[PDB]
Amino acid sequence: MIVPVRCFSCGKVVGDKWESYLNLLQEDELDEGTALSRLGLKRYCCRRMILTHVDLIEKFLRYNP
Amino acid sequence: QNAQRDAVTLFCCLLRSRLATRRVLQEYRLTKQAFDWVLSNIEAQFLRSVVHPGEMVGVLAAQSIGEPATQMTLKKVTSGVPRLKEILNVAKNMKTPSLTVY
Amino acid sequence: MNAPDRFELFLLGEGESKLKIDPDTKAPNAVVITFEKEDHTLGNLIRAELLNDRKVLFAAYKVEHPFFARFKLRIQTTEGYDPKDALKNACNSIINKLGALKTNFETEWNLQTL
Amino acid sequence: TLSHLRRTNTPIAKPRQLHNTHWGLVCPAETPEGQACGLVKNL
Amino acid sequence: SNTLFDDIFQVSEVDPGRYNKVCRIEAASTTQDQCKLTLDINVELFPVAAQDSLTVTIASSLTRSWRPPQAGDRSLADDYDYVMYGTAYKFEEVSKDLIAVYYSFGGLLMRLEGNYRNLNNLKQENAYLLIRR
Amino acid sequence: ASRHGQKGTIGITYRREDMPFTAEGIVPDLIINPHAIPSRMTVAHLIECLLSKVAALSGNEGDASPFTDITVEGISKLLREHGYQSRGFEVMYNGHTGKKLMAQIFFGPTYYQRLRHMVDDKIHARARGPMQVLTRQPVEGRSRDGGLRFGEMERDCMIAHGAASFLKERLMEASDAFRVHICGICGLMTVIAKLN
Amino acid sequence: EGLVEYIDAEEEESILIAMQPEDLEPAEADVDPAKRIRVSHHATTFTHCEIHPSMILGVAASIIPFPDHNQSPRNTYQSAMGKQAMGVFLTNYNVRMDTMANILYYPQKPLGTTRAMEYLKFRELPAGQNAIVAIACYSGY
Amino acid sequence: YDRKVPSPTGEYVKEPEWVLETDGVNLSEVMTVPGIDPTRIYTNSFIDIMEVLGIEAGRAALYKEVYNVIASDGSYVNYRHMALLVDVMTTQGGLTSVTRHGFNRSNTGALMRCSFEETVEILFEAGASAELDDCRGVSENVILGQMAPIGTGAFDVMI
Amino acid sequence: FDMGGYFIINGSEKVLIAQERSAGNIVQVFKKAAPSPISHVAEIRSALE
Amino acid sequence: EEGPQVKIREASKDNVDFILSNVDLAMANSLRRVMIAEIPTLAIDSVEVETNTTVLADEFIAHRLGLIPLQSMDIEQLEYSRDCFCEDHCDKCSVVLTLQAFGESESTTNVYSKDLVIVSNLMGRNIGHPIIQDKEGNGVLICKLRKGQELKLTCVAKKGIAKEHAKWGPAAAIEFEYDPWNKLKHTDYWYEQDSAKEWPQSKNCEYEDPPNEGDPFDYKAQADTFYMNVESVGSIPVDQVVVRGIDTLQKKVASILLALTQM
Amino acid sequence: KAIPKDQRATTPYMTKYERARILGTRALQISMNAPVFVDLEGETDPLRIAMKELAEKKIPLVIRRYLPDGSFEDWSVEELIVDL
Amino acid sequence: RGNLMGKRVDFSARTVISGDPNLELDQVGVPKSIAKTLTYPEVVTPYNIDRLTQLVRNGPNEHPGAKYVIRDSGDRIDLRYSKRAGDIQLQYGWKVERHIMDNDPVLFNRQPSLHKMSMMAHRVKVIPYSTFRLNLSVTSPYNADFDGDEMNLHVPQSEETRAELSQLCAVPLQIVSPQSNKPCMGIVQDTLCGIRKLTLRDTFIELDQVLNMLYWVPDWDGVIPTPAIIKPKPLWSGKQILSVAIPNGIHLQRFDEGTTLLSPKDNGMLIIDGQIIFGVVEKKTVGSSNGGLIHVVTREKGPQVCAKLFGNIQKVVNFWLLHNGFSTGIGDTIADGPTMREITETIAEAKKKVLDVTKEAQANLLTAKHGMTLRESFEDNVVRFLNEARDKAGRLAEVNLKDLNNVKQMVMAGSKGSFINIAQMSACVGQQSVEGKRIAFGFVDRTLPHFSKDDYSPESKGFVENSYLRGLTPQEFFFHAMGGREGLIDTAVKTAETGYIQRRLVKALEDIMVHYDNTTRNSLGNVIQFIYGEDGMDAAHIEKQSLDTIGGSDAAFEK
RNA sequence: AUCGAGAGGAG
DNA sequence: CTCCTCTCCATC
Ligand SMILES: [Zn+2]
Ligand SMILES: [Zn+2]
């Protein structure tokens, strides 16, 4: 369910980063590694918040009313 | 009065072995007062060790064997939980019988 | 459901002042101060700072249970010098030390670029 | 769900033990603790 | 209230026996041959090593609450480098006409072995140890 | 729980400030105590941990598949070239003090699972309450504000203590206790209770 | 085209099987001390080879990372704790009406996955977060 | 087998001795064999030992056994307990089993025996045979919900 | 994602758990205990599929 | 000039990387503690969902709003809601906020943090602005909406401190290292062969002298020089984060000083 | 029947059981405002009171001890020694 | 059986338990909730009216209050409702059902109920958070762990009843237990891995720390102990202050294999008068040992003093370990490269040995041992050739482990672990078994259909050559998978008997008890035993003490 | 009231 | 023919 704001163990706002993470994954061909670093995510706690998150909302939305 | 002696007999030969003259002078050098104290409290120490009329021994013994029983889980003999099961049952049909001639 | 409220960590309650003071029975010139609604953030602080003062024999703190914010600072000191001052003098020392740390940091924050 | 849909019970030799022929038909690890231990098995 | 033994010892082995800070030091007494000493020295804050000479004092004086120093204005019997505090446990007849005391400097241990160290080297709680030079 | 049968319960909740922390400022989400490791052989658990670190850093899939050429000596090299010490350890600092830790610590991402059984759907007390019909004893479950069974086996442990009155308190006052009238001749309960 | 056939346990009784279909039947012609020790090619007839041995595992147990480095009954324990471990159980949980239904606020896929964890759809409807853990004594709580 | 044993000089010293350990029990006949010490020969058959050497030798083999099961696990139980268990078995005459046919039929109160295994049948024959039950047992007072002859209720308080 | 091997009955889903049973039409031999005059027995559960 | 010295190597909008000289460990720490947990901030504390046909449930959303960064620059001249004498809100304590979003489009409409509308009296001060550090200028995904789904509500941001909830932290991650080569010998390295090759030298080893083997242990040594670096979520800008630390610390230090007097 | 103030074995010492039910039996009186037969030096618990009445041997209670043959013995709480 | 001899009952509660290393041994951290719920009927007596009328006014849901006030005529006055609940003047002799209060007696147990010890009196300590908290050294006798074991609390209801917990069942009284005439609580995990760590020579704690630790013990005498070190720096030994917790007149004599009043391996244990002289404290000293400091302190000083002790040792070592701290990595299960090489060649010469017996036995020269089959004397040889391979490869693992090795350190401490745990985790795992025999032929004359028939080598009958950190292989996995499970079977079954046995054993001795003539009789009056235990001694007050009248020289006895 | 599954701890 | 517990389902 959606990208968490802020990362549980460290505190860095990670919310804004999601939609960003996706493009420099796939717009300008980059490997998930380097993408987490361009986004300022240097700590692994604060890297794992994004590397792992499965955006289940997109699939939630697929339902109708 | 005869069980009284018998019931103490073991404790005494200890007592003797330790509070015998040459030792209570040489190895550990007591003094009339000090000694007389060692003697004094040993009586009141013993006294406190006697079983209290009431002590519910039935359960007490049983649990005390029934517990270590549960600590058992895994040289060709029936041991452990299943042996106990023979022993308590007066096993007519004992799986490993075995003489041990001397 | 049994949880204690999260503001009970810095607010005080009722008929609960932020310092209790009491004389330690065991030693002479000895005092055990109970801090309501505080912890290591400034228990450890005063204690080591109540240590650089040469007129102090003894100085320790302890959070009885990390369940409630209350630590006990016990202090014994030299013949004469009442510990109530010992605490003061140290509590102040800190104020200055930090007071200086602020400006000094201010100075150097204004040197940098970006 | 994935597992509960693939479960194998057995009613009532040594039937709970993991047997050589179970190799790659029954899961060696997956079976419930106590009660019906091993008697139920997963594919 | 005084000073209870003295001599200059000759260290014959250092023992780093699975410890970094604490060493066991076996020594010998130059003066009278009827003497040897095993002692537990904190080689971290005072190194001890090869065929090395050092002086050993005991004393028993200069007890409710240890003060801090301030002693940068006091008397210390500090003319020494290394000085620990102990309790004495068993005093043993090696045999003879020979004697030996044992010591626990809070677990750092000491064996001294001689004779003239009888009415001198006492029985009690008191017992410091001052090494130097 | 972890992923290798390392079932635990929270015993205490610490804030970010009383937590130990690495020199890069990371607090840990979880302190499991290293007494749990060596009496249930769970070596994987530890391995997972080390690979994960490297996965969280290399921004990669951790490859934990069963039969592979995936080595602890393989994994560890990888996180040497990364910046940490090739076996997970990270110098941490105590939280109250900020004094260094006398001994390094194992740290890492580690898939953890929050299982059912949470304290509050369990906590049950009863001080008198609803009885059943048949025997006016208190009723099963905590679903019913029931009562707790002081079954035979515990009574044994009450007989052992030589607790006489107290075993009576369980076996009369709380639970049953009933007042029946009995015959001075026959000895049954045929007595008429015309009380008043 | 018959490159794979379905063998039942009784027919199993009369075959020679290969764990790996690669380093199992090539030519025999250094040994990185860290790689576990597998026996040898020993046996010459091989009727049919194994697809991949991980597939001897169930649906709960293949969710375990490195089950092969673990003490067996532990694996088993997981295997019964995976079926009590909270998460996204179905995408439609908003519309279904079930006596009791749990889901995870921000369920993360694990960081270390299985190659089986793929058809298991697990890394898409995870049950658990990827928390940093300190293993150490602290307050002894 | 080893044997720690007195020297004339005095010191107990280890002297090894050959033992025969068998895989089959007959004790009426192996001891009566010449060549072997018939003051030590021992079976793990504590039922046979009872038929041969007397109730009182049984009491021992039965301990020795009970003990030796507990002690192979490392567990030490303090003698007074097994010595109670082992006794209750021995005391009636032979080997009274720790099961329904042993203790749970032996002329005790009815209400008690009742609260173990064959519940009704005891109560049945209890009614047919006019058994006047004692209420000196524990259970007989748990049944009746009463302050029973135990630790606290052994004695009796007065003014 | 619902792969669905169940039925619905009274709303609640229901799963039929695969049952286990020794098969028929074999044909086995069972070494029987000593206090049995019966030594070996060749058993065969016979039913038509 | 008089005591605690402080160099700063690198400074930025979000990082205060600085040495800190001539100080006790005791406080150097208690700085980090307060910094992390005790300098007050503003962040949504009441939420009044009006209509919510999202797939994210009500309390889910009411949670992330919590976590959102709201400008806490002038926060010092705002009152703790508990303290102030109005019942519930007033402009002196509380800043309100509106969020209305409604699926207007086919192509999944977001709700970023930037369409939180301030509704209360700002009274001039600097407060309650969703900090945008986003490039495209819309930090924090709140939730996503479908075609015909809306979400309307009121947020009532209040003064709070991390001790009362981590949402109120303004500090993110504070780095803290002291004595890079272990010359204090406060740790004992765990090794298999070298210890030296087995752990890597911290970037902090350049600014401090190596040991030299020929030197024996310096026993009387203490902890000077701490190599901190403060990060900043960014409700409070990087500088004040350290400062407000030194102050609030100083504050309670003094409140305990006053206490003795008030008895 | 009866057993005389003489010819008494019976342990002169107080059984841990005997003693606990003495403490109890007084505590049940002290909890229902029956008079305290010692000076209560600032204690208020009817259990902790009894423990002083016992330290000072001022409890007007007897033990009746039953021997399993149906005989019995009387023991005043001032007569028994309180060791343990 | 289900209704009369064990009833459901009131005034009871039940919850998950958790660890609390700053509770007292006898204390029971009870959640506020549960404390708000259970009630003790207290009376209106001049000694309480004050504190009591207060409670009435407090309310049946602010903690130190109550529900229900009971009167003369004998009725319920229900304090949640009722128009008069902020009034009620209390008249002497009315009972006032009160909330369970701090420091009350309670019966607190874990099940299965298999001592008089998984069952005992406790001191109540009302607390937040809905878990039942108990001290980690009342762990052993309930058989607890805090991984979600639940526990049951009962509350007395009569003054006399309260007493019957307080005097008999009190946890400190149960410290030295009749079962094994030895104490059943001790020093456990963190504490125990600390108490050793703290204590080894090398470990020196100085002023700042020492000052706190001293204060940390609540029974401190306020005198900084004179430091063992006073020289270029002053320091106290680990031992030094730990000794602050040790009471007075407490002495201990141990002596291990290499112990010689110097203990050059810091072996044995010598404690003189509340201070410790030499010797590393660990399981054998501080544990639940026979000779243990706990066994001494309890006899010598009392229960009370010993139930205080537990805390102080903990409260301290806990503190020291809070600031030192220790962990465990996979690196603590690694072994050196020339060890790892040597381990494999230790298996690989044992691999020859099996092969060569199987070489022998195939060529009909394997001499049949007496009374056993040839096939058996093969089976026997290999299984002994394969245990001795793992045990030796294990000892090679243990020897390579440096003293900085955490796993070692817990094993040295006796906190958790063993030799086998090293050996599997680092060297090899060893042979699996299924009903005592190596892995069986499930398939016809072969193990898995990946093998040939007629193969009796180790590889094929379930010898797991690889270590746990190396990672087993598929065959291997399955094999260990077979053995693992054998445990579980009886963990589901070697229980169902062991519960039926206890059930009888109890029922059959049940009502046997010492009477008022030291005789041991039962309900019938039939003597079982003429003095209890053959000497009329409670086993609690009994100690293993040598009899130096027996062994040793006819000569040495004279002299 | 009655049946029946699935779990929890001792592995 | 192991204690104790939780929770959900279907019924004359
Ligand atoms: Zn983070
Ligand atoms: Zn009648």
Ligand SMILES: [Zn+2]
């Ligand atoms: Zn306001």
